[PDB]
Design a binder for these strands. Structure first.
Ligand SMILES: [K+]
Ligand SMILES: [Mg+2]
Ligand SMILES: [Mg+2]
Ligand SMILES: [Mg+2]
Ligand SMILES: [Mg+2]
Ligand SMILES: [Mg+2]
Ligand SMILES: [Mg+2]
Ligand SMILES: [Mg+2]
Ligand SMILES: [Mg+2]
Ligand SMILES: [Mg+2]
Ligand SMILES: [Mg+2]
Ligand SMILES: [Mg+2]
Ligand SMILES: [Mg+2]
Ligand SMILES: [Mg+2]
Lengths: 325, 143, 205, 337, 132
RNA sequence: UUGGCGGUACUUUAUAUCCAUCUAGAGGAGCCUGUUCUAUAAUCGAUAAACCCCGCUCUACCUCACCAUCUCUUGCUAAUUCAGCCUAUAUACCGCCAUCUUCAGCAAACCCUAAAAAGGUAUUAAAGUAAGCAAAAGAAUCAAACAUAAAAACGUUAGGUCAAGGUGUAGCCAAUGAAAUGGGAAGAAAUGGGCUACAUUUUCUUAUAAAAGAACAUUACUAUACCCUUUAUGAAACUAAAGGACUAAGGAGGAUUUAGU
């Protein structure tokens, strides 16, 4: 009562033919695009396939691909025994020959260190590989209990005296922690025809966008869209929003700003200018100050934007009245 | 049969529930004023706000006056709950009630709130005054 | 919210960032180093390092705003402060040297001391038990106690005023009359406390 | 309109109404209307070279044509005959043989078990059903779910036989599960001279008592209908058996195989005691027949012969030899088994 | 529950093709469009007429090749040219396909007054994406 | 021996969540609109949650299916003792959906048991294993995140829809079909939703939401009704818009209830 076909297992003979067909494919794709077959590479292949078979499907897994068989197929679906039927690995009948073969090596290392007999922080800012990464190294499915047990054994190895061989071993299972630098990207300092220094930066609040041009030396003259700021912004709260960047760094009356804000309303345009001024003013302040701006909210774009209306309800969140029952 | 026995793996209600609640509170208060239940339970010096028996009679809920310290209350909770099964035994054995429901211990922090209000209230500014099953189709060749 | 939970509220205190490193408590010192590896929310449109920004008054402005009309609500509060300053200047000039000392002409200090005089220590939460309404004495938090003072002021002026009077003229007359502990809002606080006394026995319920 | 016309797959889905509120919680039959249609054949009878007629005939390139009114009527009638003939084929069926009754599954052959993992065919094995229970159980899917428990037996008629229980929601699935499970539990049953058990067998499996007796050739299978079914699978041709107590089919099947697989062959008895096993047939006179000789060393101590044996006798067996009248139901004329 | 263009789950024995497996919300994500014309682009006219021609062209091809279509046809319009790309099972003899192509091309070229070409890719049997 | 069952509590978990807290509403007035009722010669369907500005992103004729009157009888097509039918059954169905629901489950192939009515977990591991569908992931809102959409199986409600279309069974065929003209009315009624107002954080005017000058309780605020003019579409104004006066009620709404993180 089974019609669903067996999950396909790939013989080494099958993958071997898939690699000869791919190798002949590269020579043909190279001949089509007029490139040299010897130097034709995986990057050139992907670019050629995108030109010859343009697909605009959003998901990239569904687009045409001519990749090396090692990539498209799973890495190790090969037979685990020979013609006679004798498995190749002495731990085959465990069902996790690769997980237990690794736990066999690390347990033997631990025993030699304990029998044979400094700071253990040889590597810092590193993490243990996640289960998904481990499963990729072993090429076999692991459970959470199997991963948890593997880490405990690796930790015990670090606790004990470790020669350079052990340190290299544990290194394989340590992945450098991603380094996201939460530090503002300082803008360059250009020079005008007059020779005065000035920096420029963009800012976006709601639908408003601004392009400020702060000058290193000035008397505090801010011009928005070729107008003064008291005229352009008759509301105090809009002017206070322009005061926040300079007042915070005690730099009032020391710079000359030229703004160009298009889009949005009065408050959204002041907010867009505030960010544009804070980002341009970074080039003329110390790095310790740039961090004080970043930590006071002056350098982060505000992500709050109007939410779309939903069909079947009065608003983005407002619902139609629940008729009286 | 000891192992088998002790493994144990497998308007009427309104007036009745105003007597069981009063009596159970009267009885459990006496149980906790002596080391009879345990020495740990005697030293906790626990007080009982009230007892509430469910309408189904599934459980008997005993409200005990919680204290200020969470650690003191967390300890008291564990000790009281562990002995609740034993406390029920003692009430059936002294013949307080023939049938007693599983005892559950609920916290009563209300006594702290009332003390707080009186503190503020004194300090407040009041102001101046068959066909398919059968082989017939199989044996006829239809299938 | 469009801010992931990892984002941190911005700190807009000018003196705090410029303090000497040694003057900062190690707890505060730790947070600064930690925040260097965190995400910071963008500052609100009404959040500035201005020396004239008072959080209490800014909150009072938002509780008067209707339909997102902040310009009008801020204008009414600005007119109120001026109406209170002008009412004390007249009294100060028309008073003897001895009386002049007591008279307070700072509107920001009359506003804060007015609200504080209208804050109720205890509250009343209405409950229904056995088909009747038994409201019982309750204790109020610092947030609930402040909200009630502001709400009671904005509601006395909005409703119990003549038709042709304006909010800057009724609110000014109440901040000053509350500042002396004689206004109707103060009576609202007194009535709350006196009812709680009456319901002392019903606190158990 | 030509644009309101739907395909056959959608038309039959609606008309049959198989998926519906009534169907699931409580007859129309599907037909294929393109079965006999040959591309290029229409009511008008046109002949299209390269589609419904030869493109070239006797070296002549054909042209379009139309059949005469008489010729087309013949073709129309011929197709009507083929449709009626096809319908007659659908009506015609090959009836299978019943078991112990016409409406019961007991005794019904369901074929050999399926091939094994490496093309291990079992065409020499036959499968027989012994009990089929249709029981409704309680599960959240439908409140009360349905289940079919089927006990089967398998055997090659040459000493190898086995039984298994298969359960499923569908009867077909229970048949498959039981049939392939039983091929993994094959007992080998020892038959004396290929037609009977080596000796009398009496046993009680739970509350089911079985009492088998070794019989001469031509005696046939005078046993419970379920024992006849299994004995044919095992290959026993002549035996008597009586079943008493409970008639539970599983206890009778388990108890039968338990006794038949624990029986002592003559060679085993010769090896255990070291003596010759001799057979005396009344149709061969006093002639001693040697049926088993000890494999190792023949003993010289005669087996002790008691004056009066202490055997425990069954009243049912002895009662007959005591001259007591049997029931009217005993030893009736029955068809060859 | 949504019932639109969803080939519902059976018991693992139903062979669905790639096109049938994917529900409507996967259009432009995992599966493309069966017809490609310029009539639904912004500031373009004659969407109604191009769509009506497509409906007919699909019903015509099903009836002209009854039981011989492995998957839905793909219609491609360039200038006034129409191109029909159909996956067809290898059931009919080879010469019969040449007849239906010559017939279906000429008939649809004189009916819509455009050059129409038929492109047939023959498969040994329907291609099964998954068993559902 | 399984399942079911509770009007079962305690403990966690979360919920614009029962209650509590917060904001603007509904419930009162005037209107717009759906429904029920009354009622008409005069449709139909939805009508607890999950109907009630619902099929309609829409009814002056048309639309139209209704009522009255008159008229046609091979009466759209190549052919057909045929065409045609908004005739009955959504309790025969397809199609396309609602509801629990962004709830976490549904289904099949094997293996095991001193027999199985069933069950099958122990991680320092004791019989379970390996594939599906949903969730998850991925993709979309054109950096990034978050959020929002989309997605959401099997079942539950014989839930909705024979009137989108198609269709099983039964029924009409000088009529239950086709076509033309004229009509399809109203309410001292109840009720759902929406709109506007009840004003001073207001009204009018210029600018523009900045500021300024006036108005500010008897019609001051205040009619998207009625009535009267003019313009727009149309063949037809019975429709819509703009003025004009006329102006009544309304003074922030009892229990109760809706939405929002
Ligand atoms: K349906
Ligand atoms: Mg809104
Ligand atoms: Mg019979
Ligand atoms: Mg009409
Ligand atoms: Mg009409
Ligand atoms: Mg009709
Ligand atoms: Mg239904
Ligand atoms: Mg209905
Ligand atoms: Mg994405
Ligand atoms: Mg998902
Ligand atoms: Mg129904
Ligand atoms: Mg008619
Ligand atoms: Mg204004
Ligand atoms: Mg006109």
């Amino acid at each position: 009562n089974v019609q669903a076909s067996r999950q396909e297992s790939y013989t080494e003979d099958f993958i071997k033919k898939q690699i000869e067909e791919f190798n002949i494919g590269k020579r043909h794709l190279a001949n089509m695009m007029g490139e040299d077959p010897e130097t034709f590479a995986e990057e050139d292949i992907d670019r050629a396939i995108a030109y010859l078979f343009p697909s605009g499907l959003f998901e990239k897994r569904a687009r045409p691909m001519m990749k090396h068989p090692e990539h498209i197929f799973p890495k190790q679906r090969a037979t685990q025994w020979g013609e006679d039927g004798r498995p190749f690995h002495f731990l085959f009948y465990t069902g996790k020959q690769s997980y237990y073969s690794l736990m066999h090596d690390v347990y033997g290392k631990v025993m030699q260190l304990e029998k044979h007999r400094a700071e253990s922080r040889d590597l810092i800012g590193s993490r243990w590989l996640i289960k998904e990464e481990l499963e990729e190294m072993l090429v076999e499915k692991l459970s959470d209990e199997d991963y948890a047990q593997f880490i405990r054994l690796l930790e015990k190895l670090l606790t004990l005296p470790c020669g350079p061989a052990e340190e290299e071993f544990v290194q394989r299972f340590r992945r450098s922690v991603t380094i996201q630098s939460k530090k503002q990207l300082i803008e360059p300092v250009q020079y005008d025809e007059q020779g005065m220094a000035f920096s420029t930066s963009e800012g976006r609040r709601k639908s408003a966008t601004a392009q400020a041009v702060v000058y290193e030396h000035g008397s505090g003259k801010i011009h928005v869209n070729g107008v003064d700021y008291l005229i352009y912004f008759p509301i105090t709260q809009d002017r206070e929003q322009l005061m926040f960047p300079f007042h915070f760094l005690d730099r009032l009356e020391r710079h000359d700003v030229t703004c160009t804000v298009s889009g949005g309303g009065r408050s959204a345009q002041a907010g867009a200018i505030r960010l544009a001024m804070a980002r341009a003013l970074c080039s003329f302040v110390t790095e310790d100050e740039v961090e004080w701006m970043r930590q006071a909210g002056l350098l982060t774009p505000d992500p709050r934007i109007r939410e779309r209306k939903k069909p079947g309800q009065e608003g983005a969140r407002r619902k139609f009245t629940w008729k009286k029952r | 049969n000891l192992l088998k026995k002790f493994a144990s793996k497998t308007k009427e209600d309104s007036i009745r529930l105003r007597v069981l609640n009063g009596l159970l509170y009267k009885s459990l208060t006496e149980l906790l004023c002596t080391p009879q239940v345990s020495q740990e339970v005697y030293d906790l010096n626990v007080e009982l706000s009230k007892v509430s028996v469910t309408s189904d009679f599934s459980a008997c809920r005993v409200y005990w006056k919680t204290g200020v310290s969470a650690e003191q209350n967390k300890h008291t909770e564990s000790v009281l709950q562990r002995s609740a099964a034993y406390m029920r035994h003692l009430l059936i054995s002294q013949q307080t009630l023939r049938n007693v429901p599983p005892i559950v211990f609920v916290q009563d922090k209300r006594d702290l709130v009332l003390a707080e209000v009186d503190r503020l209230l004194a300090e407040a500014d009041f102001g101046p005054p068959h066909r398919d099953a059968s082989p017939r189709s199989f044996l006829l060749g239809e299938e | 919210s469009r801010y992931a939970p990892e984002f941190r509220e911005p700190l807009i205190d000018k003196e705090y960032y410029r303090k000497p490193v040694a003057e900062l408590t190690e707890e505060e010192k730790y947070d600064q180093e930690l925040k260097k590896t965190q995400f910071i929310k963008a500052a609100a449109a009404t959040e500035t390092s201005s020396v004239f920004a008072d959080p209490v008054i800014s909150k009072f402005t938002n509780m008067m705003m209707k339909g997102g009309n902040k310009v009008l609500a801020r204008s009414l509060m600005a007119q109120t402060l001026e109406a209170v300053k002008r009412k004390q200047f007249e009294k100060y000039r028309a008073a003897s040297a001895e009386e002049q000392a007591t008279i307070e002409r700072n509107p920001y200090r009359i506003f804060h001391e007015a609200l504080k005089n209208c804050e109720p220590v205890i509250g009343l939460v209405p409950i229904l038990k056995g088909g009747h309404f038994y409201q019982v004495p309750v204790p109020l938090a610092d947030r609930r106690r402040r909200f009630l003072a502001m709400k009671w002021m904005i509601t006395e002026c909005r409703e119990n005023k003549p038709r042709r009077t304006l909010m800057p003229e009724k609110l000014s007359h109440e901040l000053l009359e509350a500042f002396h502990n004689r206004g109707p809002v103060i009576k609202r606080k007194h009535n709350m406390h006196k009812m709680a006394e009456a319901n002392r026995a019903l606190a158990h319920y | 309109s030509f644009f309101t016309k739907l395909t056959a797959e959608e038309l039959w889905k609606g008309a049959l109404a198989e998926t519906g509120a009534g169907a699931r919680k409580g007859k129309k039959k599907r037909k294929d209307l393109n079965r006999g249609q040959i591309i290029g054949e229409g009511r008008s009878g046109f002949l299209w070279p390269g589609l419904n007629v030869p493109l070239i005939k006797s070296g002549v390139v054909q042209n379009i044509g139309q059949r005469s009114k008489e010729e087309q009527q013949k073709v129309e009638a011929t197709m009507v005959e083929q449709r009626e003939e096809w319908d007659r084929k659908r009506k015609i069926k090959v009836k299978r043989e019943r078991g112990w009754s016409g409406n019961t599954w007991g005794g019904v052959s369901i074929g050999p078990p399926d091939p094994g993992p490496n093309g291990e065919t079992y065409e020499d094995f036959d499968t027989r059903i012994l009990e089929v229970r249709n029981v409704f159980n309680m599960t959240a899917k439908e409140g009360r779910k349905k289940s079919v428990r089927v006990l089967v037996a398998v055997g090659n008629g040459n000493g190898a036989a086995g039984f298994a229980i298969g359960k499923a929601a569908d009867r077909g699935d229970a048949f498959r599960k039981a049939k392939n499970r039983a091929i993994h539990y094959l007992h080998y049953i020892e038959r004396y001279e290929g037609h009977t058990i080596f000796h009398d067998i009496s046993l009680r499996f739970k509350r089911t008592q079985i009492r088998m007796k070794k019989q001469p050739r031509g005696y046939g299978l005078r046993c419970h209908r379920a024992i006849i079914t299994i004995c044919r699978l095992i290959g026993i041709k002549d035996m008597y058996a009586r079943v008493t107590g409970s008639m539970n089919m599983l206890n009778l099947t388990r108890g039968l195989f338990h006794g038949l697989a624990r029986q002592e062959t003559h060679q085993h008895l010769a090896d255990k005691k070291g003596l010759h096993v001799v057979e005396f047939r009344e149709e061969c006179g006093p002639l001693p027949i040697v049926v088993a000789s000890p494999h190792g060393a023949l003993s010289k101590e005669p087996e002790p012969e008691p004056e009066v044996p202490d055997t425990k006798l069954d009243w049912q067996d002895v009662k007959a030899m005591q001259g007591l009248k049997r029931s009217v139901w005993f030893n009736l004329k029955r068809p060859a088994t | 529950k949504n019932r639109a263009a969803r080939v519902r789950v059976a018991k693992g024995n139903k062979p669905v093709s790639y096109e049938e497996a994917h529900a409507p919300h996967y259009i432009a994500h995992r599966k493309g469009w069966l017809s490609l014309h310029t009539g639904n682009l912004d500031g373009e006219d004659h969407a109604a007429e191009r769509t009506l021609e497509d409906v007919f062209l699909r019903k015509f091809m099903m009836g002209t090749f009854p039981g011989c279509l492995a998957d839905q046809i793909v219609l491609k319009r360039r200038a006034n040219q129409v191109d029909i790309c159909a996956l067809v099972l290898r059931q009919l003899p080879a010469h019969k396909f040449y007849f239906l192509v010559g017939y279906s091309e000429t008939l649809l070229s004189h009916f819509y007054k455009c050059p129409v070409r038929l492109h047939l890719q023959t498969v040994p049997s329907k291609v099964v994406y998954k068993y559902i």
